[PDB]
Design an enzyme around this catalytic site. Structure first.
Site, PDB file in Angstrom:
ATOM      1  N   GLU A   1     -77.110 -43.379 -42.656  1.00 20.16           N
ATOM      2  CA  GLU A   1     -76.831 -42.774 -41.358  1.00 20.16           C
ATOM      3  C   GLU A   1     -77.629 -43.442 -40.245  1.00 20.16           C
ATOM      4  O   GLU A   1     -77.088 -43.707 -39.167  1.00 20.16           O
ATOM      5  CB  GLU A   1     -77.143 -41.279 -41.403  1.00 20.16           C
ATOM      6  CG  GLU A   1     -76.166 -40.460 -42.229  1.00 20.16           C
ATOM      7  CD  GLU A   1     -74.826 -40.280 -41.544  1.00 20.16           C
ATOM      8  OE1 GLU A   1     -73.885 -39.782 -42.198  1.00 20.16           O
ATOM      9  OE2 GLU A   1     -74.712 -40.637 -40.352  1.00 20.16           O
TER      10      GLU A   1
ATOM     11  N   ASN B   1     -69.732 -40.935 -30.277  1.00 16.21           N
ATOM     12  CA  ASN B   1     -68.462 -40.665 -30.926  1.00 16.21           C
ATOM     13  C   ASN B   1     -67.339 -40.670 -29.895  1.00 16.21           C
ATOM     14  O   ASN B   1     -67.573 -40.606 -28.685  1.00 16.21           O
ATOM     15  CB  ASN B   1     -68.498 -39.322 -31.659  1.00 16.21           C
ATOM     16  CG  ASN B   1     -69.628 -39.241 -32.664  1.00 16.21           C
ATOM     17  OD1 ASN B   1     -70.438 -38.316 -32.633  1.00 16.21           O
ATOM     18  ND2 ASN B   1     -69.689 -40.216 -33.562  1.00 16.21           N
TER      19      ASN B   1
ATOM     20  N   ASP C   1     -65.074 -38.453 -29.097  1.00 18.33           N
ATOM     21  CA  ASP C   1     -64.907 -37.235 -28.316  1.00 18.33           C
ATOM     22  C   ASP C   1     -66.003 -37.029 -27.271  1.00 18.33           C
ATOM     23  O   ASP C   1     -66.025 -35.948 -26.663  1.00 18.33           O
ATOM     24  CB  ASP C   1     -64.853 -36.028 -29.254  1.00 18.33           C
ATOM     25  CG  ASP C   1     -66.147 -35.831 -30.053  1.00 18.33           C
ATOM     26  OD1 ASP C   1     -67.174 -36.449 -29.715  1.00 18.33           O
ATOM     27  OD2 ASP C   1     -66.131 -35.045 -31.021  1.00 18.33           O
TER      28      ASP C   1
ATOM     29  N   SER D   1     -69.239 -36.739 -27.837  1.00 16.81           N
ATOM     30  CA  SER D   1     -70.453 -36.249 -28.465  1.00 16.81           C
ATOM     31  C   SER D   1     -71.298 -37.419 -28.965  1.00 16.81           C
ATOM     32  O   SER D   1     -70.860 -38.573 -29.000  1.00 16.81           O
ATOM     33  CB  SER D   1     -70.116 -35.302 -29.612  1.00 16.81           C
ATOM     34  OG  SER D   1     -69.451 -35.991 -30.655  1.00 16.81           O
TER      35      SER D   1
ATOM     36  N   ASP E   1     -74.448 -38.568 -31.969  1.00 22.62           N
ATOM     37  CA  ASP E   1     -75.228 -38.302 -33.170  1.00 22.62           C
ATOM     38  C   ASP E   1     -76.654 -38.786 -32.951  1.00 22.62           C
ATOM     39  O   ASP E   1     -76.874 -39.845 -32.357  1.00 22.62           O
ATOM     40  CB  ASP E   1     -74.612 -38.996 -34.386  1.00 22.62           C
ATOM     41  CG  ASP E   1     -73.178 -38.573 -34.630  1.00 22.62           C
ATOM     42  OD1 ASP E   1     -72.857 -37.391 -34.385  1.00 22.62           O
ATOM     43  OD2 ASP E   1     -72.371 -39.422 -35.060  1.00 22.62           O
TER      44      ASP E   1
ATOM     45  N   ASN F   1     -74.939 -34.114 -34.940  1.00 20.49           N
ATOM     46  CA  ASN F   1     -73.967 -34.256 -33.868  1.00 20.49           C
ATOM     47  C   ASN F   1     -74.193 -33.217 -32.776  1.00 20.49           C
ATOM     48  O   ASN F   1     -74.487 -32.052 -33.058  1.00 20.49           O
ATOM     49  CB  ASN F   1     -72.551 -34.124 -34.434  1.00 20.49           C
ATOM     50  CG  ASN F   1     -71.483 -34.470 -33.423  1.00 20.49           C
ATOM     51  OD1 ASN F   1     -71.170 -33.674 -32.544  1.00 20.49           O
ATOM     52  ND2 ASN F   1     -70.917 -35.667 -33.542  1.00 20.49           N
TER      53      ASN F   1
END
Ligand code: NA
Length: 129
Positions: free
Chosen positions: A35, A46, A48, A50, A52, A59
Site C-alpha cells: 500500500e 483517487n 472520485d 478522495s 488515501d 481513504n
C-alpha cells in the site's frame, strides 16, 4: 518516516494488531508493504476526488477528514494528516475499525490482490518480536 520490515512488525504487534479479528501480523506487514512501501507519508489520489493516506492508505471518503472530499464521512474522527505521522498509533486504531466493519482486510485492494492466500508469515520472518 520509512519503516523497516521487522521494525514495523514490532510496532504493529505492540499496538495489538497480531491476530486482530483473525488476521495474523504477516497480513498487516504485507498490506503496508504494497500500500505504501512502509512510508508513513505516502499519499495517493483517487478518481472520485478522495485521497488515501499513510502507511495503510486509509481513504478520506469514509475514514478521515481532509477538507476537500465533499460528501465524505470521518468515521475514525481524525484529520487525514494525523495518518501521516511517524507514530502509527492513529493509523492502527483507524485500521482496527476498518477491519471490523464486516469485510475484513478486503477493504485494502493490495492485500486482496497481493497478500490474500500467500505465505504472509514470510513477512515477519527473521524478526525478533
Ligand atoms: Na472525509
Amino acid at each position: 518516516k520509512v519503516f523497516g520490515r521487522c521494525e514495523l512488525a514490532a510496532a504493529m504487534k505492540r499496538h495489538g494488531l497480531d491476530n486482530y479479528r483473525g488476521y495474523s501480523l504477516g497480513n498487516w506487514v504485507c498490506a503496508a508493504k504494497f500500500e505504501s512501501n512502509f512510508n508513513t507519508q505516502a499519499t495517493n489520489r483517487n478518481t472520485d476526488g478522495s485521497t488515501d493516506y499513510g502507511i495503510l492508505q486509509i481513504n478520506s471518503r469514509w475514514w478521515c477528514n481532509d477538507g476537500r472530499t465533499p460528501g465524505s464521512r470521518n468515521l475514525c474522527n481524525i484529520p487525514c494528516s494525523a495518518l501521516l505521522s511517524s507514530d502509527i498509533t492513529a493509523s492502527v486504531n483507524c485500521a482496527k475499525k476498518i477491519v471490523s466493519d464486516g469485510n475484513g482486510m478486503n477493504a485494502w485492494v493490495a492485500w486482496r490482490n497481493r497478500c490474500k492466500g500467500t505465505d504472509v508469515q514470510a513477512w515477519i520472518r527473521g524478526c525478533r518480536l
